[PDB]
Each structure stands twice: as C-alpha cells, then as structure tokens.
Amino acid sequence: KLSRVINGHLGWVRCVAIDPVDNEWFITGSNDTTMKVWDLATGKLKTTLAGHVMTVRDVAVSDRHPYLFSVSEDKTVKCWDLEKNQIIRDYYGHLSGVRTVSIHPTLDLIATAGRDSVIKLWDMRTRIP
C-alpha cells in the first residue's frame, strides 16, 4: 500500500538507489539533470547534487567505497566522493547517452552501457575503460 508521496524534482524521476550500508538515505536522478538525496525515514530532502547537463539516467552507490556513480544522456559517467559531495572522477568514452551503471561487487570496477550498444568496464582508479 502507498505510504508517502514526495515532490521536489522538476522533471520525471528516472533512477533511484538506496544507501546499501546504513539504509538511511536514497538518491534519485531526474530529467531536471539533478540528483537529490532524501532521508528514508522522513522523506525530507537532504541535498541536491548538480553535475550533469542532461537527464540523469542511472545512479549506483558503492557498498565498499564512499562513492556515488551517475550516468547521463550527456554521455558522461561521474564518480562523486560522498565525503565531500563533489565529483572526483569522470569516465570518458561512450559515443552517446549512457543508460545504466553497475558497480562490481568485489572489484574496483564499474560497468556502464547505453545507446552505443557496448558495455564498458572501467577501472575505478585510473578511469581507463
């Protein structure tokens, strides 16, 4: 059954990810090109991460690193340091919009794919596909 409705995004809510460690907050990406972090218990807006020029298509939070990975129609893939709420790494290489991202469960690697019909596996540290 429905329990809560939260409004705040200025466009469609395209992706969502829960904090996999403490379960205290969840992040959503939107057509408004921003990401918003919400308190799970109360639903209150914690913070807004603005770092894409187009729709944020997917978000992934690492269970091993204090990192958030986000991908957008603007072809970019970005790593945000959750201790600073700032972008620290950018992964360049997709020819067109990136639709999905998945963090490897045991390796410091991320998988991303989109309209260019290929999956790119990136070493987190060097940002090399």
């Binding site: 340091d81 360049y92 020819l95 019909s117």
Partner: protein, 74 residues
C-alpha cells in the same frame, strides 16, 4: 533537401573496437585522485464600496509561473 536527417540508429562502439588507436595524451586523463577510498568494516462612510457596506504538476499554470510572467512582462 535530404541532408537534414533524423537518426535511424546510433553509431555503435563495435566499429571503434576494431580500429587501431593512436597515442595522444589527453589533459583530463592525466594522473589525479590516484588512491581509492574504502569504507570501514464620516470620512469612512462616503465611498460606494467599503467594509461599512497549492502545488499542481503543470508549470505553465502554477502560481509561480504566473507571478513570474507578471513580474517580467509589463
């Protein structure tokens, strides 16, 4: 004119996968953030009138948009 076209399909990365690459060094690919972080673990009676006698999901009709238009168009 046919030069102005919609996209029938997007260029696949499989094409570039077969190409032989060059050794250009890009500024954005230089070393940086080289170490990964890990998690732990009477004057008032003489007038004809007087006391003596929301959010909606549609930007173009929200009161915010209307007041924006009233403010910027005169």
């Amino acid at each position: 004119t046919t030069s102005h076209r919609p996209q029938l399909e997007a260029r696949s990365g499989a094409k570039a996968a077969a190409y032989t690459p060059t050794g250009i060094e890009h500024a954005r690919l230089l070393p940086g953030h080289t170490t990964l972080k890990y998690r732990k673990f009477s004057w008032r009676k003489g007038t004809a009138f007087g006391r003596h006698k929301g959010y909606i999901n549609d930007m173009t009709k929200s009161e915010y948009h209307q007041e924006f238009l009233h403010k910027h168009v005169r």
